[PDB]
């Protein structure tokens, strides 16, 4: 049945491993991405012909036949999306009267033009004068004098979006403008019938924010702000700490461009963190095969390399495989030892965590952390003690970054406060760091394979977290990776990882909500209009990385000898392409619910082989 | 007689300029650069042993045949260099058995051992766990809180000591030891019959400052200190904020080995601060033919640029000649257009100087704009809108740099507290940038090259500041090159240089106190014991930079047919090698009286070469 495929798959990913040991597939977004490097490019007055061609070339190969850019494949059309692909093609060198052009533009002015886009948009615009700063809503340097106990401090907001508040806290403070060519300028935008379609914060209009960004505006037309050099100045030092070793800020797209302007405009560009920050970003670039150019949101290393490991390791190579060695102690290499800004919860708590990107110091999260730690606890590594030691201060970190809740947030400990989502900036994304089911059920599986189990109070409360938070039709959100599909998957495997009888009703429920929403193929998938339907939980078309999330749950609950899981198998046998991996061109991954979705370009190879590993095992 | 010699010198000149436009000798001073490199080495736990190894080639060429190491080429023995030479050798390999550690050893035994030694020496000792820490005099983090109108504050120093007291604050509030091998340590450097000799605080005994030391080392031994953390950040955010592109701090060595020791101690080795600064040092290394390697106390590109042009234009090169313009362009994109330092005390003035390295944008000097401006007056560009714009905000920019007294200092205006000399941290060197007379000297020249005059006020005041500080024999100090030849060389130059009648009384002394310190071969010289002994005033074997300057002198008073030029310039004629440059033993340039010498190996060329142009521009 399996066997041939396993082999196969575990040679293809072995054959996708680096050198140096680590894996990295690229990680895909949407055209915003480049279209803001563009942009950018224009505002730091660095403009590469040839780059800028490989990005035309790169935004009419994402454009569908619509006109239209979508945040997801198969996804509906974007607005935001759109206007910043058309305006970076227009300054490129794009006639707006070109087809691709005159069809993307009536989209544009059939949902209601520039007014009714997100404020990163707008602001983007704003920053090369096709938009008043005035209609931009104001986040002002002043917001660092806010204390660590008082409302809207920068530590109540979530780690990607504190370090993009901080960065424009300087950027809004000066209001910049890099007038585009003239040739390039977007009049036509605005052009339209339809009124504007006004989204605000995540949450709603509270009219206390909306007062204080009026008062912020007419503070700004003043010609005298004191203190405003000061809060400046304390933006500008807390950007400079913060600097991560590749250049960037966050290991992120957003506060890295930001944090570049606001060094631009502070005239700082001879400095040497913006000359690394600058240098930095070819780390992540891509060069693709058709002629384009992409630009990465973030860099996966660390979690594609773990997952690696396991996969490998479940599908039956051993402890000491010399390439799973040398993944180890790459591995091993990566823990972080100092102080983040998760520190602030935990000031007495010793470091030992792990990042996404290969150096993000400040920034390490608990998923990685979880799987890093559990991928070495499969491996027989030479330094027999730096393993025990890094393992120990690992698991040690994530015990301690437990929420009140019980469950585990990504970045930081209780990070759940609702006051952020309420400020007209913040109409995209989450802007808070919560516990999630997912990250929660991970580091519930890496508990698991030190042995340990109910009796320990920290995975008690875990477990009854998870519980609460179940669906009323028996399964769990997936807020990282998509979605009722990837949530619950995760979080049976965990059940099973630390002890918990999985024959009790919640879990059996949970097993019949996956066996339930196979596919016809023998498949499972799961689209990312999901976020934003109940109709669309655990529909999709099949893609290989849903279908071993489906698998591993059925697997976890001792369903192996299921029909469900040798229709899911055979689903995985058959549609393996001839190299041994399985094409997937769907996203499976999550930035923000509703607002951002992601390519993990490696889980269509690394989850399938996962999954047939638990399946070799069981039987 | 000449002409030959200048036309040698001219192609000598031409043929050692860098391919990009600019020239750059290496920058000479005495081993503590290295042996304190060594010991960083040790500190960050990276020791490169080929690197070692070529030290202590170097260390031991170095060494004279009495065991010693010296300030200057003939200097007396040193006790705090050849502590610090015996300290890194040991370390590197060397047995105390072995004879140059042997010879080396009775010295240092015989002025008092290690108690003996400045501040500086004890400290390094003391961050490898050879000296105790508590007799170390306290720089504390708290100087931070100090305003600028309170006192100690550290805009009352000078830059150069300043970014050293601002990371050494940092270092201090530690108190780090980073042990040194067993076999390396040093116990018979306090083997001694002969009793302590204390060179204290360089100005003298104010008790206040010695009871507020044993103040702030008694709080060092509480556990709690209140805001000593906020006093921490804001030393680490200031050297943040000023780190210059080529990883250094303020181009020289001891803030930059200072400021990497503090982002160690603070487990900032990831965070790209550091990386960008350890990885800047081999700029300012240099692989020596005999097989050693020395460190750079600071980099002398631009200054050696300006001082070509000069040279070279003075000899008869067009204004308009290919390698002229080459170096004028070069030096129009050098000009730094940002807030330094210096704007503490100027907020309005406009940025538009030089800095004397590739890239230290915060610390602009009034010697390299002086002399810049002035070159860039001396050339003919074809960007000339540019040329003027640059000559205009450099120029302005000197204006508004004029001290109270009618003095130009270095970096910074008034500069002058008499505070800073008196805390016993302050042994060594001089701690404060207050005017001088060469740097008003050479400000005055770059004036005079515009055709400006004493019916100036800025000119009049600078010239009754020169009338002050003339000496009783009629010569004036050489606060940057040695001694009374180079200031009286500089100062009559500028007199001439902004009209003043060089028959008025106190030049024409001037001018007959260079004629009678001519030496018998007839050159002129001055060694470096000149700063501590009335004797050595103008007094020296020749060389050739000091007989350019007093050559320059006479020229400028109109002695040009005197029998003095005469004999002076035949020396010139008679010491040039066949390659058309000269040969130059002793140093000419000063770091701070008494304390720490230069040799710029430039001197011996650029300067022949100016003050024969000048002759044959006289005649
Ligand atoms: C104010 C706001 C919202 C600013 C952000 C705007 C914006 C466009 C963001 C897009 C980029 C983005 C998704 C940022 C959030 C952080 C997400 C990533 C690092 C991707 C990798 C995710 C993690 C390691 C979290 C754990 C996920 N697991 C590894 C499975
Ligand atoms: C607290 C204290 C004293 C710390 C410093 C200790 C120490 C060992 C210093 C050695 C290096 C040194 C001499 C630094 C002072 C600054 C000197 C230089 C940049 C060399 C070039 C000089 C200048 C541009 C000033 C202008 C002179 N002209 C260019 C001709
Ligand atoms: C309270 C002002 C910000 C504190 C910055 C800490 C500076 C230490 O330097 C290392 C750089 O670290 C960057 C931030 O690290 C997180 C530590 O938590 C600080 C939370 O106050
Ligand atoms: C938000 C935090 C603000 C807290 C202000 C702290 C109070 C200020 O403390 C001033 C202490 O001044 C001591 C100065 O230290 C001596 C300097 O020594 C000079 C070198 O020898
Ligand atoms: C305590 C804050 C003092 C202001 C520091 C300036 C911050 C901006 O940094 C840009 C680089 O600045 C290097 C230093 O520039 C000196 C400007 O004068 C500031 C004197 O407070």
Same mark, same amino acid.
């Given at each position: 049945?399996?066997?041939?495929?396993?082999?196969?798959?575990?040679?293809?990913?072995?054959?996708?491993?680096?050198?140096?040991?680590?894996?990295?597939?690229?990680?895909?977004?949407?055209?915003?991405?480049?279209?803001?490097?563009?942009?950018?490019?224009?505002?730091?007055?660095?403009?590469?012909?040839?780059?800028?061609?490989?990005?035309?070339?790169?935004?009419?190969?994402?454009?569908?036949?619509?006109?239209?850019?979508?945040?997801?494949?198969?996804?509906?059309?974007?607005?935001?999306?759109?206007?910043?692909?058309?305006?970076?093609?227009?300054?490129?060198?794009?006639?707006?009267?070109?087809?691709?052009?005159?069809?993307?533009?009536?989209?544009?002015?059939?949902?209601?033009?520039?007014?009714?886009?997100?404020?990163?948009?707008?602001?983007?615009?704003?920053?090369? =004068?096709?938009?008043?700063?005035?209609?931009?809503?104001?986040?002002?340097?002043? *917001?660092?004098?806010?204390?660590?106990?008082?409302?809207?401090?920068?530590?109540?907001?979530?780690?990607?979006?504190?370090?993009?508040?901080?960065?424009?806290?300087?950027?809004?403070?000066?209001?910049?403008?890099?007038?585009?060519?003239?040739?390039?300028?977007?009049?036509?935008?605005?052009?339209?019938?339809?009124?504007?379609?006004? %989204?605000?914060?995540?949450?709603?209009?509270?009219?206390?924010?909306?007062?204080?960004?009026?008062?912020?505006?007419?503070?700004?037309?003043?010609?005298?702000?004191?203190?405003?050099?000061?809060?400046?100045?304390?933006?500008?030092?807390?950007?400079?700490?913060?600097?991560?070793?590749? +250049?960037?800020?966050?290991?992120?797209?957003?506060?890295?461009?930001?944090?570049?302007?606001?060094?631009?405009?502070?005239?700082?560009?001879?400095?040497?963190?913006?000359?690394?920050?600058?240098?930095?970003?070819?780390?992540?670039?891509?060069?693709?095969?058709?002629?384009?150019?992409?630009?990465?949101?973030?860099?996966? !290393?660390?979690?594609?390399?773990?997952?690696?490991?396991?996969?490998? %390791?479940?599908?039956?190579?051993?402890?000491?495989?010399?390439?799973?060695?040398?993944?180890?102690?790459?591995?091993?290499?990566?823990? *972080? @030892?100092? !102080?983040?800004?998760?520190?602030?919860?935990?000031?007495?708590?010793?470091?030992?965590?792990?990042?996404?990107?290969?150096?993000?110091?400040?920034?390490?999260?608990?998923?990685?952390?979880?799987?890093?730690?559990?991928?070495?606890?499969?491996?027989?590594?030479?330094?027999?003690?730096?393993? %025990?030691?890094?393992?120990?201060?690992?698991?040690?970190? *994530?015990?301690?970054?437990?929420?009140?809740?019980?469950?585990?947030?990504?970045?930081?400990?209780?990070?759940?406060?609702?006051?952020?989502?309420?400020?007209?900036?913040?109409?995209?994304?989450?802007?808070?760091?919560?516990?999630?089911?997912?990250?929660?059920?991970?580091?519930?599986?890496?508990? +698991?394979?030190?042995?340990?189990?109910?009796?320990?109070?920290?995975?008690?409360?875990?477990?009854?977290?998870?519980?609460?938070?179940?669906?009323?039709?028996?399964?769990?959100?997936?807020?990282?990776?998509?979605?009722?599909?990837?949530?619950?998957?995760?979080?049976?495997?965990?059940?099973?990882?630390? =002890?918990?009888?999985?024959?009790?009703?919640?879990?059996?429920?949970?097993?019949?909500?996956?066996?339930?929403?196979?596919?016809?193929?023998?498949?499972?998938?799961?689209?990312?209009?999901?976020?934003?339907?109940?109709?669309?939980?655990?529909?999709?078309?099949?893609?290989?990385?849903?279908?071993?999330?489906?698998?591993?749950?059925?697997?976890?609950?001792?369903?192996?000898?299921?029909?469900?899981?040798?229709?899911?198998?055979?689903?995985?046998?058959? @549609?393996?392409?001839?190299?041994?991996?399985?094409?997937?061109?769907?996203?499976?991954?999550?930035?923000?619910? +509703?607002?951002?979705?992601?390519?993990?370009?490696?889980?269509?190879?690394?989850?399938?082989?996962?999954?047939?590993?638990?399946?070799?095992?069981?039987?």
């Amino acid at each position: 049945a399996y066997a041939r495929t396993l082999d196969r798959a575990v040679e293809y990913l072995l054959s996708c491993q680096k050198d140096e040991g680590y894996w990295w597939g690229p990680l895909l977004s949407n055209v915003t991405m480049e279209a803001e490097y563009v942009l950018l490019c224009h505002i730091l007055d660095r403009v590469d012909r040839d780059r800028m061609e490989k990005i035309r070339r790169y935004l009419l190969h994402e454009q569908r036949e619509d006109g239209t850019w979508a945040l997801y494949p198969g996804g509906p059309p974007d607005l935001d999306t759109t206007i910043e692909a058309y305006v970076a093609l227009k300054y490129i060198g794009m006639s707006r009267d070109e087809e691709p052009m005159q069809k993307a533009l009536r989209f544009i002015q059939s949902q209601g033009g520039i007014e009714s886009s997100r404020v990163f948009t707008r602001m983007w615009l704003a920053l090369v =004068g096709e938009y008043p700063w005035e209609k931009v809503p104001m986040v002002p340097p002043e *917001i660092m004098f806010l204390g660590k106990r008082m409302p809207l401090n920068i530590y109540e907001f979530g780690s990607w979006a504190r370090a993009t508040v901080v960065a424009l806290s300087i950027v809004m403070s000066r209001q910049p403008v890099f007038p585009l060519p003239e040739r390039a300028r977007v009049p036509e935008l605005y052009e339209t019938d339809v009124p504007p379609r006004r %989204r605000g914060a995540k949450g709603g209009g509270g009219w206390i924010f909306d007062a204080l960004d009026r008062a912020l505006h007419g503070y700004q037309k003043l010609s005298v702000h004191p203190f405003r050099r000061a809060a400046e100045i304390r933006a500008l030092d807390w950007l400079l700490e913060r600097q991560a070793g590749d +250049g960037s800020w966050g290991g992120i797209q957003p506060p890295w461009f930001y944090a570049l302007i606001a060094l631009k405009i502070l005239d700082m560009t001879q400095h040497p963190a913006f000359i690394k920050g600058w240098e930095g970003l070819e780390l992540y670039g891509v060069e693709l095969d058709y002629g384009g150019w992409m630009f990465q949101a973030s860099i996966s !290393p660390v979690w594609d390399t773990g997952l690696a490991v396991l996969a490998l %390791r479940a599908a039956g190579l051993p402890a000491d495989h010399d390439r799973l060695v040398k993944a180890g102690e790459w591995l091993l290499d990566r823990q *972080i @030892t100092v !102080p983040g800004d998760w520190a602030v919860k935990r000031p007495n708590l010793k470091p030992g965590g792990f990042a996404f990107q290969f150096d993000n110091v400040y920034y390490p999260d608990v998923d990685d952390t979880a799987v890093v730690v559990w991928a070495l606890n499969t491996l027989r590594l030479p330094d027999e003690r730096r393993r %025990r030691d890094a393992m120990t201060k690992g698991f040690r970190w *994530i015990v301690g970054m437990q929420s009140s809740n019980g469950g585990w947030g990504a970045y930081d400990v209780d990070n759940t406060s609702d006051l952020p989502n309420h400020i007209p900036f913040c109409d995209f994304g989450e802007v808070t760091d919560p516990p999630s089911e997912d990250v929660t059920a991970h580091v519930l599986e890496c508990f +698991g394979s030190f042995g340990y189990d109910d009796a320990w109070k920290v995975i008690r409360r875990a477990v009854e977290y998870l519980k609460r938070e179940q669906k009323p039709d028996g399964s769990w959100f997936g807020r990282w990776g998509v979605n009722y599909l990837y949530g619950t998957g995760a979080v049976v495997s965990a059940l099973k990882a630390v =002890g918990i009888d999985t024959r009790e009703p919640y879990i059996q429920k949970a097993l019949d909500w996956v066996e339930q929403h196979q596919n016809p193929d023998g498949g499972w998938g799961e689209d990312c209009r999901s976020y934003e339907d109940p109709a669309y939980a655990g529909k999709g078309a099949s893609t290989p990385s849903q279908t071993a999330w489906a698998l591993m749950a059925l697997i976890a609950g001792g369903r192996a000898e299921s029909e469900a899981a040798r229709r899911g198998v055979q689903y995985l046998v058959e @549609t393996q392409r001839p190299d041994g991996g399985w094409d997937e061109p769907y996203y499976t991954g999550t930035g923000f619910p +509703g607002d951002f979705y992601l390519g993990y370009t490696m889980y269509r190879h690394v989850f399938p082989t996962l999954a047939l590993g638990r399946y070799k095992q069981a039987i």
